[PDB]
Subunit: 295 residues, 4 copies
């Protein structure tokens, strides 16, 4: 659990024209993130298109990322599946590969009781064989709505070392910080990062950090130095980008920017995601050029 | 020979004590359904625990069910995955095994545009090579809320032969029947089956048909003969059972009933589903005895 | 008719060009409903535009409708307001005017505990001085989402004699009938009337009954006689009308049809409701003619 | 001269028979002024307006103006579901000398967005020059507006501000980015510091009645770049809000105000019930702590 606090990018999974893993672009993207100063990578989560990959495909990505980055930056393996046994297989693999921590989204589609969710985390923690667990709360995508008391119980389970909080409820963010002063608490919605840190988060995990992670590190520094205006300006600039990416489709817009930066060979997401509408390419090319000039 | 209208059980997947497929119990369950007069089986859907199975495990179940039932009753293979490519693999297997139709839940977890959903169905229909597609609308589990205009577009795509409507909105059920007089329209919530037929459904697919399918066939017969009192009485009896299964957990309560009926050897669902609370066993054993006396 | 069961129109409130009550048109509408063979009127509910009327305006309508219909058909006074004291004033007026029952929507806007809801009903029942209470459950408009156990507690409060169930959940409709075999249970969504009766409602209250109440009485008779086909055909015709009224705006579309039927002098609703888009007048006039010819 | 600032959403004190307690209303207005509040928002949810008649709401507007006009800013929430009723209140607010009017999106019945716009235009007409504060509170009204709809509302002729009772701080930043000079009040007290950081330039809140100075302290701390002080103050506000949500907010606030010798009888109007007596020790202890701090 060596310090898990920080700004960590939710890594994308590059694919080739036939939708297979593009290993060389994966390695390039890991190195690009390290080069840009990110504190760590969250691998195999929503942003990595894990839910449109098989288990073996997810392991393959975890293995390659560890080869490229173990020892250089922190690595968190998102091993969550609806199935507990599948999540356990991935957690055992993350341990074999040398990750620093594992994480799992609350299992979705079928409704499960809170006790069932707790037992699922406990089983995954057991298979992780010592790697701390990062509980992942993302009600918008999972459809699982936890109460504060439920979140408190999950984060206090033996073996849990952090919470990735993908919720826009900043009253709840403050309540979680108040109940757990030492908890590693990652803000999950990039578009509210500055407000999330002010409410109590102490870092973040996000998809847009792959192209402008230094802006989020800039907001952490600005808030630490009491430079409110610089923090607001950086968040505003991040939000102009996020508005565009929500229009284009976020993962595919990010991959398109990284393709214009010569990091990702083919900017496609796996079906059923479609391609980026060509009407957005002028904006995406201009953003890539701007970000390359900036840093 | 090609009629998909009717009362079709959503098949459960029996597991052994190690959570692996119990083939002998799967075969016994297929035969049990055929013996109760079911019109067909919907295989590999929610009820079959498809979302906690691998693709190979799903194909294994499809293959075994076709060995046991092809030619005896209608067989619909639910081949839907979040991934379009995985769904295409299962659609081609369903055609090789001789299923009568395929079906796919709207892809979930990630938000997809309506056009993305339409292209996902078109791709699966291409891979089903002749087997009609049953569009599957289940907003409560998938999180995908389609408008009536969107449902109308989906059910008119070339190659779509039916709609499994797991919605309790019976105004929408009537509107779909009025716009598509010839559409095979399956009521998906067993607890409103009689009302759903009255609103316009011409059959149903449901999990509880595994243990009392003859009651739903009885409701169809009663409404056809104008016997409202018998239809209401049968629906009331089904709802007394559904109330219990919602308290126990539906799939595991059904597997438990089937275990007492000597069909399923071990009644467990896959983790994260937990076991049935022992406090409910008296009622489940009594229900198994009552249903056996009725059949 | 020594009970409250039946088909009761939710009465509209006609206004003149200045948006003040049009007494002559209100009397014509009450008589028009009686001529259709309606069993009663539900007055001062959503459909009478009560929530854009003052307490004295609501009282005025109650007084006039009792003058016109007391002793001819059943009269239920919806007296509900957010305030308990205001609801009590209208309940006392309804008793003085000779209504057969009072009714109150669950108080809305502010969240109230279930105990507070129960106390609100008890206080209104005290002021109603013997008139039975019709609990009114309409989650879509009120924002109040009651559980089945809470509905069961409300309908068994002392002095409660019926439930107006404006919910499209027909599983809950059947559960309420199963728990309360003798309860007067009105189906609230006109577009699912036939299915609501099949699920357990024993009558209905609806806005569209003002222009075609004989159709809903026809559905009750058809189901009683086991003529499923006629019930379905009548429900389909009602739903073709409801589809139109939802496009035009329901209260104003209904008022416009009644204007073409020579009942309502000026078909306006009160701001913020706007007027009917002129493009819909031909369809509304054609409908009035169709209904007048059908009678 | 502007409407930016920290404004308390005023409570309406009642006597034991649920009628307006005028003397307690006047004491509460002066108590807010003494706390350094910038203005009062009168006749909104917090004032129990939706369980008051039009005449009762006018009466409160009149008394508050008598007590505070010319001392602090006054915003009259005149919204009703009915447009004509809202117009009557707007005309009264102008007669009494309020600085602005405000109206919640009409609720209960679903209205089209054009109908909402026409409702605000009619109220603005009757307000006869007073600026309109659009009030977006989806959790209570049930009206869910898109960002484009909010942009259209805040740019209607005569609109001068938006009370944003939404915890979506991405939308808060988007509104600030689209309208740099808009008066934008944070509506959820428990996220005030984060709301100002996202773009709000003030706030309107029910809890300001008992600790308004803490919210002014957060505004000052952020302006001076003292993040830790802002966070510590928000944390203290949230420990209080956690309690008030357990006790019931309006009645808990009135009970604290009663222990502060401001409100004679702390009841809310039915259907609100009384404060569970198990919570009185905590409420009295809070009143004592606030008076000592203050």
């Amino acid at each position: 659990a060596t310090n898990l606090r920080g700004v960590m990018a939710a890594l994308l999974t590059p694919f080739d024209q036939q939708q297979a893993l593009d290993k060389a672009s994966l390695r390039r993207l890991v190195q690009f993130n390290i080069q840009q100063g990110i504190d760590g990578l969250y691998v195999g989560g929503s942003t990595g298109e894990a839910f449109v990959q098989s288990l073996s495909e997810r392991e393959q990505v975890l293995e390659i990322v560890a080869e490229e980055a173990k020892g250089k930056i922190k690595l968190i393996a998102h091993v969550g599946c609806v199935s507990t046994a599948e999540s356990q297989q991935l957690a055992a693999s993350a341990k074999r590969y040398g990750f620093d921590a594992v994480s799992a989204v609350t299992p979705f589609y079928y409704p499960f009781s809170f006790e069932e969710h707790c037992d699922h985390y406990r089983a995954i923690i057991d298979s992780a064989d010592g790697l701390p667990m990062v509980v992942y709360n993302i009600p918008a995508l999972s459809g699982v709505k936890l109460t504060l008391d439920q979140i408190n119980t999950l984060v206090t389970l033996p073996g849990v070392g952090a919470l990735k909080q993908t919720s826009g409820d900043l009253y709840q963010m403050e309540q979680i910080r108040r109940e757990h002063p030492d908890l590693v608490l990652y803000n999950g919605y990039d578009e509210i990062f500055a407000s999330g840190l002010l409410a109590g988060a102490d870092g973040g995990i996000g998809s847009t950090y792959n192209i402008m992670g230094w802006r989020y590190q800039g907001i952490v520094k600005a808030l630490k130095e009491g430079d409110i205006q610089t923090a607001q300006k950086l968040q505003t600039e991040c939000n102009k980008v996020i508005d565009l990416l929500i229009k284009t489709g976020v993962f595919r817009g990010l991959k398109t920017v990284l393709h214009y930066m010569d990091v990702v060979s083919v900017p496609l997401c796996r079906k059923p995601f479609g391609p980026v509408d060509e009407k957005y390419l002028p904006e995406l090319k201009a953003l890539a050029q701007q970000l390359m000039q900036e840093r």
